[PDB]
Amino acid sequence: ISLDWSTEEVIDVVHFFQAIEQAYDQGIAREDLLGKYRRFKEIVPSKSEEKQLFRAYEQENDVSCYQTIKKAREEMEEHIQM
Amino acid sequence: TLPISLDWSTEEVIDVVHFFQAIEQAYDQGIAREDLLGKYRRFKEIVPSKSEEKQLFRAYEQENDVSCYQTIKKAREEMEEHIQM
Ligand SMILES: [Mg+2]
């Protein structure tokens, strides 16, 4: 059973997608991006919901939320640029 | 015609498992268009190669009465949210 979001949670999710965009712009610190992702997953624990949000966001933006986060999780590079 | 070998992470294996389960769900009680496509999108993140995708669909369909192509095609082209094959 899923839980509805508080206004604070909505903002945290907005910040997450803005972090993804930042990765494709001037870049973002690994620690920053992972922190935004950690928070995103606290709010969206469902793997299915995550996939739906990622696809919906990518429909209008030429980015890959999955590949960006995968890189941040697996690589030790301090600065991430997609 | 090269013999395919797949190198996926643990989570990616499960993402692929969820994709095929999604296709099966479409033939059972049905599934939401958005969920199905979300899982197909992830499948393509893991299997960007069209040749690998084609062979995986074939491998699954050889033992399961479903059509990955028909299901995703219908989902992509039609607007109804509830998809049932
Ligand atoms: Mg409710």
UniProtKB/Swiss-Prot annotation, chain A:
Q: Which Gene3D superfamilies match?
A: BH2638-like
**Matches recorded under Pfam families:** UPF0223 (PF05256)
What family does the entry list? Belongs to the UPF0223 family.
HAMAP family associated with the record? UPF0223
Official protein name in the record: UPF0223 protein BH2638
From Swiss-Prot, chain B:
Q: Domain of life, per the record?
A: Bacteria
Instruction: Identify the InterPro entries for this entry.
Output: BH2638-like_sf, UPF0223
Q: Which SUPFAM superfamilies match?
A: BH2638-like
* Family statement: Belongs to the UPF0223 family.
| The protein's name in its UniProt record | UPF0223 protein BH2638
Native species of this protein?
Halalkalibacterium halodurans (strain ATCC BAA-125 / DSM 18197 / FERM 7344 / JCM 9153 / C-125)
